[PDB]
Design a protein around this ligand. Structure first.
Ligand code: HEM
Length: 392
Protein backbone atom coordinates (compact mmCIF):
# COMPACT_ATOMS: atom_id res chain seq x y z
CA UNK A 1 0.00 0.00 0.00
CA UNK A 2 2.40 2.70 1.30
CA UNK A 3 5.05 0.09 0.50
CA UNK A 4 4.58 0.66 -3.24
CA UNK A 5 5.35 4.32 -2.57
CA UNK A 6 8.59 3.27 -0.74
CA UNK A 7 9.69 0.96 -3.63
CA UNK A 8 9.21 3.84 -6.10
CA UNK A 9 10.35 6.97 -4.21
CA UNK A 10 11.87 6.27 -0.81
CA UNK A 11 12.13 9.90 0.25
CA UNK A 12 14.27 9.27 3.37
CA UNK A 13 16.62 6.60 1.98
CA UNK A 14 20.21 7.91 2.17
CA UNK A 15 21.15 6.42 -1.26
CA UNK A 16 18.06 8.02 -2.83
CA UNK A 17 19.10 11.36 -1.29
CA UNK A 18 22.57 10.99 -2.73
CA UNK A 19 21.37 10.00 -6.18
CA UNK A 20 17.65 9.67 -6.97
CA UNK A 21 18.02 9.53 -10.73
CA UNK A 22 17.84 5.73 -10.94
CA UNK A 23 14.55 5.83 -9.00
CA UNK A 24 13.35 8.60 -11.29
CA UNK A 25 14.18 6.41 -14.34
CA UNK A 26 11.54 3.92 -13.23
CA UNK A 27 9.02 6.44 -11.87
CA UNK A 28 8.86 8.15 -15.29
CA UNK A 29 8.60 5.05 -17.49
CA UNK A 30 6.27 2.91 -15.35
CA UNK A 31 4.23 5.44 -13.25
CA UNK A 32 4.51 8.91 -14.91
CA UNK A 33 1.44 10.18 -13.08
CA UNK A 34 1.48 8.46 -9.67
CA UNK A 35 -0.99 8.98 -6.80
CA UNK A 36 0.68 8.76 -3.42
CA UNK A 37 -1.07 7.42 -0.38
CA UNK A 38 -1.38 10.95 1.07
CA UNK A 39 -3.14 12.18 -2.09
CA UNK A 40 -0.22 13.91 -3.86
CA UNK A 41 0.24 13.28 -7.52
CA UNK A 42 3.84 12.93 -8.80
CA UNK A 43 4.06 14.14 -12.42
CA UNK A 44 7.39 13.17 -13.94
CA UNK A 45 7.28 13.25 -17.79
CA UNK A 46 8.83 16.34 -19.38
CA UNK A 47 5.93 16.93 -21.89
CA UNK A 48 3.62 16.69 -18.89
CA UNK A 49 5.51 19.00 -16.55
CA UNK A 50 5.99 21.43 -19.41
CA UNK A 51 2.39 21.60 -20.54
CA UNK A 52 0.51 21.29 -17.25
CA UNK A 53 2.68 23.19 -14.69
CA UNK A 54 2.14 26.59 -16.37
CA UNK A 55 -1.61 26.34 -16.79
CA UNK A 56 -3.47 29.23 -15.10
CA UNK A 57 -5.57 26.71 -13.10
CA UNK A 58 -2.39 25.68 -11.16
CA UNK A 59 -2.46 27.68 -7.92
CA UNK A 60 0.42 28.24 -5.48
CA UNK A 61 -1.78 29.60 -2.64
CA UNK A 62 -2.74 26.31 -0.80
CA UNK A 63 0.98 25.48 -0.47
CA UNK A 64 1.13 28.33 2.02
CA UNK A 65 -1.95 27.39 4.17
CA UNK A 66 -0.10 25.82 7.16
CA UNK A 67 3.36 27.09 6.27
CA UNK A 68 4.39 27.48 9.94
CA UNK A 69 7.77 29.19 10.13
CA UNK A 70 7.62 29.69 6.33
CA UNK A 71 4.61 32.07 6.83
CA UNK A 72 7.26 34.79 6.94
CA UNK A 73 7.97 34.28 3.20
CA UNK A 74 4.28 34.07 2.08
CA UNK A 75 3.72 37.71 1.10
CA UNK A 76 6.20 37.40 -1.79
CA UNK A 77 5.89 36.45 -5.49
CA UNK A 78 5.72 32.67 -4.85
CA UNK A 79 2.66 33.08 -2.57
CA UNK A 80 0.43 34.74 -5.12
CA UNK A 81 -1.40 33.62 -8.22
CA UNK A 82 -1.99 36.11 -11.04
CA UNK A 83 -3.15 38.80 -11.29
CA UNK A 84 -1.52 39.94 -7.98
CA UNK A 85 1.56 37.91 -8.79
CA UNK A 86 2.43 40.27 -11.59
CA UNK A 87 2.29 43.33 -9.35
CA UNK A 88 4.90 41.84 -6.97
CA UNK A 89 7.11 40.16 -9.51
CA UNK A 90 7.51 43.35 -11.48
CA UNK A 91 9.17 45.08 -8.47
CA UNK A 92 12.20 42.84 -8.66
CA UNK A 93 12.27 42.25 -12.46
CA UNK A 94 13.06 45.89 -13.12
CA UNK A 95 16.28 45.47 -11.00
CA UNK A 96 17.62 42.55 -12.99
CA UNK A 97 17.50 43.63 -16.63
CA UNK A 98 20.54 42.20 -18.36
CA UNK A 99 22.47 45.56 -18.34
CA UNK A 100 21.88 46.02 -14.59
CA UNK A 101 23.01 42.41 -14.03
CA UNK A 102 26.36 43.04 -15.81
CA UNK A 103 26.76 45.80 -13.28
CA UNK A 104 25.86 43.64 -10.23
CA UNK A 105 28.28 40.83 -11.02
CA UNK A 106 31.31 43.16 -10.98
CA UNK A 107 31.03 42.49 -7.21
CA UNK A 108 31.26 38.78 -7.81
CA UNK A 109 34.33 39.38 -10.00
CA UNK A 110 36.16 41.57 -7.45
CA UNK A 111 35.54 39.07 -4.66
CA UNK A 112 36.70 35.90 -6.43
CA UNK A 113 39.75 37.88 -7.53
CA UNK A 114 40.61 39.15 -4.01
CA UNK A 115 40.45 35.56 -2.89
CA UNK A 116 42.62 33.95 -5.56
CA UNK A 117 45.20 36.78 -5.05
CA UNK A 118 45.81 35.43 -1.53
CA UNK A 119 46.26 31.82 -2.68
CA UNK A 120 49.60 30.04 -3.13
CA UNK A 121 50.37 27.24 -5.54
CA UNK A 122 48.99 23.96 -4.10
CA UNK A 123 46.89 25.52 -1.37
CA UNK A 124 43.62 23.63 -0.76
CA UNK A 125 40.68 26.10 -1.20
CA UNK A 126 37.33 25.27 0.32
CA UNK A 127 35.20 26.14 -2.71
CA UNK A 128 31.75 25.94 -1.13
CA UNK A 129 32.21 28.82 1.24
CA UNK A 130 34.86 30.83 -0.54
CA UNK A 131 33.89 30.62 -4.23
CA UNK A 132 30.10 29.89 -4.00
CA UNK A 133 28.35 31.02 -0.80
CA UNK A 134 30.24 34.27 0.18
CA UNK A 135 30.63 35.76 -3.29
CA UNK A 136 26.94 35.22 -4.22
CA UNK A 137 25.67 36.29 -0.85
CA UNK A 138 27.66 39.54 -0.93
CA UNK A 139 26.69 40.24 -4.53
CA UNK A 140 23.00 40.05 -3.67
CA UNK A 141 23.48 42.00 -0.42
CA UNK A 142 25.06 44.90 -2.43
CA UNK A 143 22.20 44.89 -4.95
CA UNK A 144 19.82 45.18 -1.97
CA UNK A 145 22.16 47.66 -0.15
CA UNK A 146 22.22 45.65 3.08
CA UNK A 147 25.05 44.57 5.41
CA UNK A 148 27.17 41.89 3.72
CA UNK A 149 28.97 40.23 6.59
CA UNK A 150 26.55 37.52 7.72
CA UNK A 151 26.95 34.92 5.01
CA UNK A 152 27.84 32.13 7.41
CA UNK A 153 24.83 32.55 9.73
CA UNK A 154 22.45 33.22 6.80
CA UNK A 155 23.53 30.01 5.18
CA UNK A 156 23.06 27.81 8.28
CA UNK A 157 19.72 29.44 8.92
CA UNK A 158 18.46 28.56 5.41
CA UNK A 159 19.99 25.02 5.59
CA UNK A 160 17.85 24.51 8.68
CA UNK A 161 14.75 26.16 7.25
CA UNK A 162 14.85 24.02 4.13
CA UNK A 163 14.61 20.69 5.95
CA UNK A 164 10.85 21.10 6.33
CA UNK A 165 10.47 21.31 2.55
CA UNK A 166 11.17 17.48 2.47
CA UNK A 167 8.15 15.29 1.64
CA UNK A 168 9.11 13.44 4.84
CA UNK A 169 10.35 15.76 7.46
CA UNK A 170 12.10 14.40 10.60
CA UNK A 171 10.76 15.08 14.04
CA UNK A 172 12.07 18.50 14.95
CA UNK A 173 12.44 20.04 11.49
CA UNK A 174 9.50 22.44 11.79
CA UNK A 175 11.16 23.53 15.08
CA UNK A 176 14.58 24.06 13.50
CA UNK A 177 12.83 26.20 10.86
CA UNK A 178 11.22 28.35 13.60
CA UNK A 179 14.65 29.05 15.07
CA UNK A 180 16.10 29.89 11.65
CA UNK A 181 13.35 32.12 10.42
CA UNK A 182 12.96 33.95 13.70
CA UNK A 183 16.70 34.66 13.35
CA UNK A 184 16.37 35.90 9.76
CA UNK A 185 13.27 38.11 10.70
CA UNK A 186 15.11 39.74 13.58
CA UNK A 187 18.20 40.49 11.51
CA UNK A 188 16.06 41.95 8.71
CA UNK A 189 13.98 43.99 11.16
CA UNK A 190 17.27 45.38 12.51
CA UNK A 191 18.82 46.29 9.12
CA UNK A 192 15.54 47.96 8.00
CA UNK A 193 15.29 50.11 11.05
CA UNK A 194 18.84 51.24 10.19
CA UNK A 195 17.74 51.77 6.61
CA UNK A 196 14.58 53.90 7.60
CA UNK A 197 16.94 56.27 9.44
CA UNK A 198 19.74 56.24 6.78
CA UNK A 199 18.22 55.31 3.34
CA UNK A 200 20.29 54.13 0.39
CA UNK A 201 19.32 53.62 -3.26
CA UNK A 202 19.25 49.78 -3.49
CA UNK A 203 16.60 47.16 -4.17
CA UNK A 204 15.55 47.23 -0.43
CA UNK A 205 15.09 50.96 -0.59
CA UNK A 206 13.13 50.41 -3.80
CA UNK A 207 10.75 47.92 -2.19
CA UNK A 208 10.38 50.15 0.91
CA UNK A 209 9.60 53.20 -1.33
CA UNK A 210 7.07 51.08 -3.13
CA UNK A 211 5.24 50.30 0.20
CA UNK A 212 5.26 53.91 1.37
CA UNK A 213 3.65 54.73 -2.08
CA UNK A 214 1.03 52.00 -1.68
CA UNK A 215 2.14 49.99 -4.78
CA UNK A 216 2.66 47.02 -2.41
CA UNK A 217 2.04 46.52 1.33
CA UNK A 218 4.67 47.03 4.01
CA UNK A 219 4.54 43.31 4.63
CA UNK A 220 5.28 42.30 1.00
CA UNK A 221 8.28 44.64 0.98
CA UNK A 222 9.73 43.24 4.18
CA UNK A 223 9.09 39.65 3.09
CA UNK A 224 10.42 40.15 -0.44
CA UNK A 225 13.50 41.80 1.04
CA UNK A 226 13.99 38.83 3.43
CA UNK A 227 13.62 36.17 0.73
CA UNK A 228 16.16 37.78 -1.60
CA UNK A 229 18.55 38.60 1.22
CA UNK A 230 18.43 34.98 2.48
CA UNK A 231 18.37 33.04 -0.79
CA UNK A 232 20.96 35.28 -2.54
CA UNK A 233 23.52 32.51 -1.79
CA UNK A 234 21.50 29.38 -1.85
CA UNK A 235 20.53 27.46 -5.00
CA UNK A 236 23.02 29.57 -6.97
CA UNK A 237 25.63 28.60 -4.38
CA UNK A 238 24.82 24.91 -5.10
CA UNK A 239 25.12 25.54 -8.84
CA UNK A 240 28.56 27.14 -8.73
CA UNK A 241 29.78 24.38 -6.42
CA UNK A 242 28.31 21.72 -8.75
CA UNK A 243 29.98 23.27 -11.74
CA UNK A 244 33.29 23.44 -9.94
CA UNK A 245 33.02 19.72 -9.15
CA UNK A 246 32.19 18.94 -12.76
CA UNK A 247 35.15 20.93 -14.01
CA UNK A 248 37.34 18.79 -11.74
CA UNK A 249 35.89 15.44 -12.94
CA UNK A 250 35.72 16.41 -16.60
CA UNK A 251 38.72 18.76 -17.15
CA UNK A 252 38.18 18.94 -20.93
CA UNK A 253 34.98 20.87 -20.09
CA UNK A 254 36.85 23.46 -18.05
CA UNK A 255 39.35 23.71 -20.95
CA UNK A 256 36.41 24.21 -23.32
CA UNK A 257 35.05 26.90 -21.00
CA UNK A 258 38.49 28.65 -20.96
CA UNK A 259 39.06 28.60 -24.69
CA UNK A 260 35.59 29.11 -26.20
CA UNK A 261 33.62 32.03 -24.86
CA UNK A 262 30.62 31.25 -27.14
CA UNK A 263 30.24 27.72 -25.53
CA UNK A 264 29.96 28.99 -21.95
CA UNK A 265 26.25 29.62 -21.72
CA UNK A 266 25.58 26.16 -23.06
CA UNK A 267 28.09 24.61 -20.61
CA UNK A 268 26.35 26.29 -17.71
CA UNK A 269 22.87 25.25 -18.97
CA UNK A 270 23.97 21.62 -19.18
CA UNK A 271 25.30 21.80 -15.63
CA UNK A 272 21.89 23.21 -14.59
CA UNK A 273 20.03 20.49 -16.47
CA UNK A 274 21.94 17.63 -14.87
CA UNK A 275 22.07 18.82 -11.26
CA UNK A 276 19.09 21.00 -10.33
CA UNK A 277 19.27 22.22 -6.68
CA UNK A 278 15.46 22.10 -6.30
CA UNK A 279 14.32 18.71 -7.42
CA UNK A 280 10.56 19.57 -7.43
CA UNK A 281 7.63 21.92 -6.79
CA UNK A 282 4.00 21.78 -5.83
CA UNK A 283 0.90 23.22 -7.39
CA UNK A 284 -2.82 22.87 -6.55
CA UNK A 285 -5.37 22.78 -9.46
CA UNK A 286 -8.45 25.02 -9.01
CA UNK A 287 -10.53 22.56 -11.14
CA UNK A 288 -10.27 18.90 -12.13
CA UNK A 289 -7.55 18.16 -14.66
CA UNK A 290 -6.54 15.06 -16.56
CA UNK A 291 -2.83 14.22 -17.03
CA UNK A 292 -1.46 10.96 -18.48
CA UNK A 293 -4.96 9.36 -18.33
CA UNK A 294 -5.39 9.99 -14.57
CA UNK A 295 -8.14 12.33 -13.39
CA UNK A 296 -6.90 14.75 -10.67
CA UNK A 297 -9.47 16.37 -8.44
CA UNK A 298 -9.55 20.14 -7.86
CA UNK A 299 -7.38 20.86 -4.79
CA UNK A 300 -5.12 17.79 -4.97
CA UNK A 301 -1.49 18.68 -4.53
CA UNK A 302 0.56 18.05 -7.64
CA UNK A 303 4.31 17.58 -7.32
CA UNK A 304 6.18 18.28 -10.55
CA UNK A 305 9.42 16.39 -10.63
CA UNK A 306 11.94 18.77 -12.30
CA UNK A 307 14.89 16.51 -11.82
CA UNK A 308 13.01 13.51 -13.26
CA UNK A 309 11.93 15.50 -16.22
CA UNK A 310 15.43 16.87 -17.02
CA UNK A 311 16.40 13.21 -17.82
CA UNK A 312 13.40 12.41 -20.03
CA UNK A 313 14.66 10.29 -22.97
CA UNK A 314 11.87 11.52 -25.34
CA UNK A 315 13.61 14.91 -25.14
CA UNK A 316 17.31 14.41 -24.31
CA UNK A 317 19.41 11.66 -25.98
CA UNK A 318 21.85 9.87 -23.69
CA UNK A 319 20.28 11.86 -20.81
CA UNK A 320 22.76 10.91 -18.03
CA UNK A 321 25.85 12.10 -19.89
CA UNK A 322 27.09 15.65 -19.72
CA UNK A 323 27.09 17.09 -23.20
CA UNK A 324 27.19 20.82 -23.87
CA UNK A 325 27.03 20.47 -27.67
CA UNK A 326 23.30 19.53 -27.69
CA UNK A 327 21.10 21.55 -30.15
CA UNK A 328 19.20 24.58 -28.75
CA UNK A 329 15.84 22.72 -28.48
CA UNK A 330 16.47 19.36 -26.78
CA UNK A 331 18.44 21.55 -24.39
CA UNK A 332 15.55 23.36 -22.56
CA UNK A 333 15.61 22.18 -18.95
CA UNK A 334 13.14 22.85 -16.15
CA UNK A 335 15.70 23.70 -13.42
CA UNK A 336 14.59 27.32 -13.09
CA UNK A 337 10.94 26.21 -13.27
CA UNK A 338 8.38 27.71 -15.70
CA UNK A 339 5.27 29.87 -16.09
CA UNK A 340 4.73 32.88 -14.01
CA UNK A 341 6.78 31.52 -11.01
CA UNK A 342 9.75 30.98 -13.24
CA UNK A 343 12.82 31.91 -11.11
CA UNK A 344 13.03 35.57 -10.36
CA UNK A 345 16.81 35.20 -10.03
CA UNK A 346 17.44 33.35 -13.28
CA UNK A 347 19.34 36.15 -15.07
CA UNK A 348 21.71 37.07 -12.15
CA UNK A 349 22.27 33.42 -11.38
CA UNK A 350 23.49 32.57 -14.85
CA UNK A 351 25.72 35.65 -14.79
CA UNK A 352 27.19 34.94 -11.31
CA UNK A 353 28.06 31.39 -12.33
CA UNK A 354 29.58 32.64 -15.59
CA UNK A 355 31.58 35.25 -13.78
CA UNK A 356 33.02 32.97 -11.05
CA UNK A 357 33.95 30.33 -13.65
CA UNK A 358 35.36 33.11 -15.85
CA UNK A 359 37.76 34.38 -13.16
CA UNK A 360 38.90 30.78 -12.56
CA UNK A 361 39.26 30.37 -16.32
CA UNK A 362 41.42 33.49 -16.68
CA UNK A 363 43.95 32.36 -14.08
CA UNK A 364 44.13 28.49 -14.02
CA UNK A 365 44.02 25.59 -16.42
CA UNK A 366 43.02 22.70 -14.15
CA UNK A 367 40.71 22.09 -11.15
CA UNK A 368 41.19 19.14 -8.89
CA UNK A 369 39.51 17.69 -5.85
CA UNK A 370 41.61 17.51 -2.68
CA UNK A 371 39.16 14.98 -1.16
CA UNK A 372 35.68 13.65 -1.85
CA UNK A 373 33.10 16.46 -1.41
CA UNK A 374 30.83 16.50 1.62
CA UNK A 375 27.13 16.79 0.72
CA UNK A 376 23.87 17.09 2.75
CA UNK A 377 21.13 16.44 0.24
CA UNK A 378 17.48 15.79 0.73
CA UNK A 379 14.56 14.75 -1.49
CA UNK A 380 13.63 18.33 -2.22
CA UNK A 381 16.90 20.32 -2.19
CA UNK A 382 20.53 19.53 -2.85
CA UNK A 383 23.40 20.88 -0.79
CA UNK A 384 27.19 20.93 -0.45
CA UNK A 385 28.78 21.24 2.99
CA UNK A 386 32.44 21.26 1.82
CA UNK A 387 34.23 21.17 -1.67
CA UNK A 388 38.02 21.13 -1.25
CA UNK A 389 39.86 22.01 -4.45
CA UNK A 390 43.44 22.68 -5.68
CA UNK A 391 43.80 25.06 -8.67
CA UNK A 392 46.70 24.66 -11.16
C1 HEM B 1 20.35 33.79 -7.42
C2 HEM B 1 19.46 33.85 -6.45
C3 HEM B 1 18.05 33.36 -6.70
C4 HEM B 1 17.05 34.07 -6.28
C5 HEM B 1 17.21 35.48 -5.62
C6 HEM B 1 15.92 33.29 -6.62
C7 HEM B 1 14.72 33.72 -6.34
C8 HEM B 1 13.57 33.09 -6.65
C9 HEM B 1 12.23 33.65 -6.38
C10 HEM B 1 12.05 35.01 -5.73
C11 HEM B 1 11.34 32.78 -6.85
C12 HEM B 1 9.81 32.79 -6.89
C13 HEM B 1 9.39 33.54 -8.18
C14 HEM B 1 7.88 33.77 -8.37
O1 HEM B 1 7.13 32.88 -7.85
O2 HEM B 1 7.45 34.78 -9.05
C15 HEM B 1 12.13 31.69 -7.38
C16 HEM B 1 11.61 30.60 -7.94
C17 HEM B 1 12.36 29.52 -8.29
N1 HEM B 1 13.70 29.47 -8.28
FE1 HEM B 1 15.05 30.77 -7.75
N2 HEM B 1 16.27 32.05 -7.19
C18 HEM B 1 17.63 32.10 -7.23
C19 HEM B 1 18.43 31.14 -7.76
C20 HEM B 1 17.91 30.03 -8.30
C21 HEM B 1 18.66 29.03 -9.01
C22 HEM B 1 20.22 28.97 -9.35
C23 HEM B 1 17.70 28.14 -9.21
C24 HEM B 1 17.74 26.84 -9.94
C25 HEM B 1 18.87 26.43 -10.51
C26 HEM B 1 16.39 28.60 -8.70
C27 HEM B 1 15.27 27.84 -8.80
C28 HEM B 1 14.05 28.20 -8.73
C29 HEM B 1 12.96 27.36 -9.03
C30 HEM B 1 12.76 25.93 -9.57
C31 HEM B 1 11.82 28.31 -8.76
C32 HEM B 1 10.36 27.94 -8.98
C33 HEM B 1 9.73 27.11 -7.89
C34 HEM B 1 8.21 27.07 -8.04
O3 HEM B 1 7.65 27.53 -9.08
O4 HEM B 1 7.55 26.58 -7.07
N3 HEM B 1 16.56 29.71 -8.12
N4 HEM B 1 13.48 31.94 -7.28
Amino acid sequence: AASIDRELVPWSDPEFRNNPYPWYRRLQQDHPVHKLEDGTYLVSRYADVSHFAKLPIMSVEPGWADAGPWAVASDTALGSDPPHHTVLRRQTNKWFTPKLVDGWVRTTRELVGDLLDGVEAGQVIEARRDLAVVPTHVTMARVLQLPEDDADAVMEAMFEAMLMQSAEPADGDVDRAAVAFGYLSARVAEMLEDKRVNPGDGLADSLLDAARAGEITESEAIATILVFYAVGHMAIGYLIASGIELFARRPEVFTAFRNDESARAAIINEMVRMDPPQLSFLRFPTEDVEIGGVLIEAGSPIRFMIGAANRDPEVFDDPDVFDHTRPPAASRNLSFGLGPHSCAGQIISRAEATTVFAVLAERYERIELAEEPTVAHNDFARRYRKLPIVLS
